[PDB]
Design a protein around this ligand. Structure first.
Ligand SMILES: CCc1ccsc1-c1cnc(N)c([C@H]2CC[C@H](C(=O)O)CC2)n1
Ligand SMILES: [Cl-]
Ligand SMILES: [Cl-]
Length: 247
Protein backbone atom coordinates (compact mmCIF):
# COMPACT_ATOMS: atom_id res chain seq x y z
CA UNK A 1 0.00 0.00 0.00
CA UNK A 2 1.34 3.45 0.96
CA UNK A 3 3.42 4.96 3.77
CA UNK A 4 1.07 7.93 4.08
CA UNK A 5 -1.49 5.46 5.46
CA UNK A 6 0.54 5.24 8.67
CA UNK A 7 1.97 7.61 11.24
CA UNK A 8 5.35 6.97 12.87
CA UNK A 9 5.09 7.33 16.66
CA UNK A 10 8.77 6.72 17.40
CA UNK A 11 11.85 4.66 16.64
CA UNK A 12 12.40 1.39 18.48
CA UNK A 13 15.83 0.27 17.30
CA UNK A 14 18.37 0.89 14.54
CA UNK A 15 15.59 1.08 11.32
CA UNK A 16 12.54 -0.20 13.20
CA UNK A 17 9.63 2.00 14.23
CA UNK A 18 6.35 1.78 16.10
CA UNK A 19 3.57 3.09 13.85
CA UNK A 20 -0.18 3.69 13.81
CA UNK A 21 -2.45 2.76 10.89
CA UNK A 22 -4.75 5.76 10.27
CA UNK A 23 -7.83 3.80 9.11
CA UNK A 24 -8.49 2.16 12.51
CA UNK A 25 -5.63 3.36 14.71
CA UNK A 26 -4.10 -0.12 14.93
CA UNK A 27 -0.62 -0.18 16.52
CA UNK A 28 2.01 -1.82 14.30
CA UNK A 29 5.72 -1.84 13.66
CA UNK A 30 7.63 -1.36 10.39
CA UNK A 31 11.21 -2.01 9.36
CA UNK A 32 12.89 0.51 7.01
CA UNK A 33 15.20 -0.78 4.29
CA UNK A 34 17.07 1.53 1.90
CA UNK A 35 17.64 -0.34 -1.37
CA UNK A 36 18.87 2.74 -3.24
CA UNK A 37 22.40 1.31 -3.23
CA UNK A 38 21.46 -2.25 -4.17
CA UNK A 39 22.11 -4.04 -7.45
CA UNK A 40 19.21 -5.42 -9.46
CA UNK A 41 20.29 -8.90 -8.31
CA UNK A 42 20.27 -7.95 -4.63
CA UNK A 43 16.79 -6.49 -5.16
CA UNK A 44 15.41 -9.60 -6.87
CA UNK A 45 16.54 -11.67 -3.89
CA UNK A 46 14.93 -9.12 -1.60
CA UNK A 47 11.66 -9.39 -3.54
CA UNK A 48 11.55 -13.18 -3.25
CA UNK A 49 12.72 -13.13 0.32
CA UNK A 50 9.92 -10.79 1.29
CA UNK A 51 7.65 -13.06 -0.62
CA UNK A 52 8.40 -16.04 1.68
CA UNK A 53 7.56 -13.88 4.67
CA UNK A 54 3.99 -13.18 3.69
CA UNK A 55 3.45 -16.93 3.33
CA UNK A 56 4.22 -17.76 6.98
CA UNK A 57 1.14 -17.47 9.17
CA UNK A 58 1.46 -18.94 12.66
CA UNK A 59 0.57 -17.70 16.17
CA UNK A 60 4.17 -18.20 17.29
CA UNK A 61 5.81 -16.41 14.34
CA UNK A 62 5.90 -12.59 14.10
CA UNK A 63 3.10 -11.70 11.67
CA UNK A 64 3.93 -9.61 8.61
CA UNK A 65 1.13 -7.51 7.13
CA UNK A 66 2.46 -5.60 4.18
CA UNK A 67 5.36 -4.34 2.13
CA UNK A 68 5.48 -0.67 1.14
CA UNK A 69 7.63 0.81 -1.61
CA UNK A 70 8.67 4.45 -1.52
CA UNK A 71 10.66 4.78 -4.74
CA UNK A 72 11.23 8.49 -4.08
CA UNK A 73 13.49 7.87 -1.08
CA UNK A 74 14.30 4.33 -2.25
CA UNK A 75 12.93 2.82 0.96
CA UNK A 76 11.05 -0.44 1.43
CA UNK A 77 8.91 -0.76 4.57
CA UNK A 78 7.92 -4.11 6.02
CA UNK A 79 4.87 -3.71 8.23
CA UNK A 80 4.42 -6.15 11.04
CA UNK A 81 2.93 -7.00 14.39
CA UNK A 82 3.96 -4.97 17.43
CA UNK A 83 5.38 -7.18 20.18
CA UNK A 84 5.07 -4.99 23.23
CA UNK A 85 7.32 -7.14 25.45
CA UNK A 86 10.39 -6.60 23.28
CA UNK A 87 12.99 -9.30 22.57
CA UNK A 88 14.28 -12.12 24.75
CA UNK A 89 17.88 -10.84 24.79
CA UNK A 90 16.82 -7.79 26.81
CA UNK A 91 14.86 -9.94 29.21
CA UNK A 92 17.97 -12.06 29.88
CA UNK A 93 20.16 -8.97 30.10
CA UNK A 94 17.72 -7.43 32.56
CA UNK A 95 17.62 -10.57 34.70
CA UNK A 96 21.41 -10.54 34.92
CA UNK A 97 21.44 -6.98 36.29
CA UNK A 98 18.83 -7.20 39.03
CA UNK A 99 20.28 -10.63 39.85
CA UNK A 100 16.76 -12.04 39.47
CA UNK A 101 16.03 -15.37 37.79
CA UNK A 102 13.00 -15.91 35.51
CA UNK A 103 10.01 -18.03 36.64
CA UNK A 104 9.96 -21.65 35.49
CA UNK A 105 6.45 -20.92 34.17
CA UNK A 106 7.94 -18.38 31.76
CA UNK A 107 10.65 -20.80 30.71
CA UNK A 108 7.96 -23.45 30.00
CA UNK A 109 5.92 -21.02 27.87
CA UNK A 110 9.02 -20.15 25.85
CA UNK A 111 9.98 -23.81 25.39
CA UNK A 112 6.43 -24.74 24.29
CA UNK A 113 5.83 -21.81 21.97
CA UNK A 114 9.28 -21.85 20.30
CA UNK A 115 9.07 -25.62 19.76
CA UNK A 116 5.76 -25.09 17.94
CA UNK A 117 7.35 -22.33 15.86
CA UNK A 118 10.17 -24.75 14.90
CA UNK A 119 7.75 -27.49 13.97
CA UNK A 120 6.12 -25.06 11.56
CA UNK A 121 9.46 -23.97 10.02
CA UNK A 122 10.40 -27.62 9.51
CA UNK A 123 7.00 -28.38 8.00
CA UNK A 124 7.39 -25.56 5.46
CA UNK A 125 10.55 -27.25 4.16
CA UNK A 126 15.25 -18.65 11.17
CA UNK A 127 17.92 -17.96 13.80
CA UNK A 128 17.03 -19.48 17.17
CA UNK A 129 18.69 -16.85 19.31
CA UNK A 130 17.41 -14.61 22.12
CA UNK A 131 17.65 -11.43 20.05
CA UNK A 132 15.22 -13.00 17.56
CA UNK A 133 12.51 -14.05 19.98
CA UNK A 134 9.75 -11.60 20.80
CA UNK A 135 7.07 -11.21 23.44
CA UNK A 136 3.60 -9.70 22.89
CA UNK A 137 1.15 -8.35 25.48
CA UNK A 138 -0.65 -11.60 26.29
CA UNK A 139 2.17 -13.92 27.34
CA UNK A 140 2.80 -15.11 23.78
CA UNK A 141 6.22 -15.90 22.37
CA UNK A 142 7.08 -15.21 18.73
CA UNK A 143 9.95 -16.15 16.41
CA UNK A 144 11.28 -13.37 14.13
CA UNK A 145 12.85 -13.42 10.67
CA UNK A 146 16.48 -12.46 11.14
CA UNK A 147 17.11 -15.12 10.54
CA UNK A 148 32.71 -10.78 15.16
CA UNK A 149 30.58 -12.43 17.83
CA UNK A 150 31.25 -15.77 19.48
CA UNK A 151 28.87 -18.45 18.10
CA UNK A 152 27.53 -19.64 21.50
CA UNK A 153 24.75 -21.75 19.92
CA UNK A 154 26.67 -23.57 17.17
CA UNK A 155 25.99 -27.32 17.38
CA UNK A 156 28.66 -30.08 17.30
CA UNK A 157 27.51 -31.17 13.83
CA UNK A 158 27.03 -27.70 12.38
CA UNK A 159 30.54 -27.07 13.71
CA UNK A 160 32.17 -29.96 11.86
CA UNK A 161 29.69 -30.74 9.21
CA UNK A 162 19.78 -31.03 10.35
CA UNK A 163 16.59 -30.48 12.35
CA UNK A 164 18.23 -31.85 15.52
CA UNK A 165 20.64 -28.91 15.13
CA UNK A 166 17.73 -26.56 15.87
CA UNK A 167 16.97 -28.60 18.98
CA UNK A 168 20.50 -28.00 20.25
CA UNK A 169 20.13 -24.25 19.71
CA UNK A 170 16.79 -24.20 21.54
CA UNK A 171 18.51 -26.08 24.35
CA UNK A 172 21.19 -23.39 24.47
CA UNK A 173 18.51 -20.69 24.46
CA UNK A 174 16.38 -22.20 27.24
CA UNK A 175 19.52 -23.02 29.23
CA UNK A 176 20.58 -19.37 28.90
CA UNK A 177 17.08 -18.29 29.97
CA UNK A 178 17.42 -20.26 33.19
CA UNK A 179 21.08 -19.66 34.11
CA UNK A 180 21.38 -16.10 32.69
CA UNK A 181 24.44 -17.32 30.83
CA UNK A 182 25.00 -19.80 27.93
CA UNK A 183 26.02 -23.45 28.61
CA UNK A 184 29.39 -22.93 26.94
CA UNK A 185 31.43 -19.74 27.19
CA UNK A 186 34.90 -18.90 25.93
CA UNK A 187 36.96 -15.96 24.66
CA UNK A 188 37.71 -17.44 21.21
CA UNK A 189 35.78 -19.73 18.87
CA UNK A 190 38.52 -22.37 19.08
CA UNK A 191 38.25 -22.51 22.89
CA UNK A 192 34.46 -22.52 22.49
CA UNK A 193 34.65 -25.43 20.03
CA UNK A 194 36.84 -27.20 22.58
CA UNK A 195 34.17 -26.93 25.28
CA UNK A 196 31.29 -27.98 23.01
CA UNK A 197 32.94 -31.22 21.83
CA UNK A 198 33.27 -32.08 25.51
CA UNK A 199 29.52 -31.58 26.08
CA UNK A 200 29.80 -30.54 29.74
CA UNK A 201 28.09 -27.62 31.47
CA UNK A 202 26.66 -26.64 34.85
CA UNK A 203 23.17 -27.70 35.97
CA UNK A 204 20.73 -24.82 35.56
CA UNK A 205 20.02 -23.20 38.95
CA UNK A 206 18.37 -25.33 41.66
CA UNK A 207 15.25 -23.16 41.69
CA UNK A 208 14.39 -25.07 38.46
CA UNK A 209 12.88 -28.58 38.67
CA UNK A 210 14.75 -31.76 37.75
CA UNK A 211 12.25 -32.29 34.92
CA UNK A 212 13.11 -28.93 33.33
CA UNK A 213 16.84 -29.58 33.78
CA UNK A 214 16.49 -33.04 32.26
CA UNK A 215 14.80 -31.91 29.05
CA UNK A 216 17.20 -29.03 28.47
CA UNK A 217 20.05 -31.44 29.20
CA UNK A 218 18.69 -33.87 26.54
CA UNK A 219 18.51 -31.08 23.94
CA UNK A 220 22.17 -30.48 24.68
CA UNK A 221 23.11 -34.07 23.89
CA UNK A 222 26.29 -34.43 21.82
CA UNK A 223 24.49 -36.99 19.60
CA UNK A 224 21.74 -35.38 17.54
CA UNK A 225 19.89 -38.71 17.51
CA UNK A 226 19.65 -38.64 21.34
CA UNK A 227 18.10 -35.19 21.27
CA UNK A 228 14.31 -35.13 21.56
CA UNK A 229 12.23 -34.28 18.49
CA UNK A 230 9.66 -31.52 18.45
CA UNK A 231 7.06 -34.23 19.05
CA UNK A 232 8.97 -35.76 21.94
CA UNK A 233 9.43 -32.29 23.48
CA UNK A 234 5.68 -31.48 23.45
CA UNK A 235 4.74 -34.90 24.94
CA UNK A 236 6.65 -33.86 28.09
CA UNK A 237 4.43 -33.78 31.20
CA UNK A 238 5.78 -30.30 32.03
CA UNK A 239 3.95 -28.84 29.05
CA UNK A 240 0.33 -27.83 29.65
CA UNK A 241 -2.42 -26.01 27.70
CA UNK A 242 -1.81 -22.68 29.45
CA UNK A 243 1.83 -22.68 28.18
CA UNK A 244 0.61 -22.30 24.58
CA UNK A 245 -0.41 -19.13 22.80
CA UNK A 246 -3.68 -17.40 23.62
CA UNK A 247 -5.44 -14.61 21.73
C1 LIG B 1 8.96 -2.62 22.90
C2 LIG B 1 9.28 -2.79 21.46
C3 LIG B 1 10.55 -3.51 21.20
C4 LIG B 1 11.94 -3.40 22.10
C5 LIG B 1 12.95 -4.32 21.55
S1 LIG B 1 12.24 -5.08 20.23
C6 LIG B 1 10.81 -4.54 20.07
C7 LIG B 1 9.94 -4.94 19.06
C8 LIG B 1 8.55 -4.81 19.17
N1 LIG B 1 7.76 -5.26 18.12
C9 LIG B 1 8.32 -5.85 17.01
N2 LIG B 1 7.51 -6.37 15.96
C10 LIG B 1 9.72 -6.00 16.93
C11 LIG B 1 10.41 -6.68 15.78
C12 LIG B 1 11.79 -6.16 15.32
C13 LIG B 1 12.17 -6.54 13.90
C14 LIG B 1 11.93 -8.01 13.60
C15 LIG B 1 12.65 -8.60 12.44
O1 LIG B 1 13.83 -8.37 12.30
O2 LIG B 1 11.95 -9.21 11.43
C16 LIG B 1 10.52 -8.49 13.96
C17 LIG B 1 10.12 -8.14 15.39
N3 LIG B 1 10.51 -5.55 17.97
CL1 LIG C 1 21.51 -14.18 40.07
CL1 LIG D 1 24.09 -24.07 39.69
Amino acid sequence: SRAEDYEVLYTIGTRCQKIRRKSDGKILVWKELDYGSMTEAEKQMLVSEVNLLRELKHPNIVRYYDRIIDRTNTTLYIVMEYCEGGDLASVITKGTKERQYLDEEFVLRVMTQLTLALKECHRRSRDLKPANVFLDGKQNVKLGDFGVGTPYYMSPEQMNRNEKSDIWSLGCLLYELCALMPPFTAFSQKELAGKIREGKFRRIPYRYSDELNEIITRMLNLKDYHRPSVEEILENPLILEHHHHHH
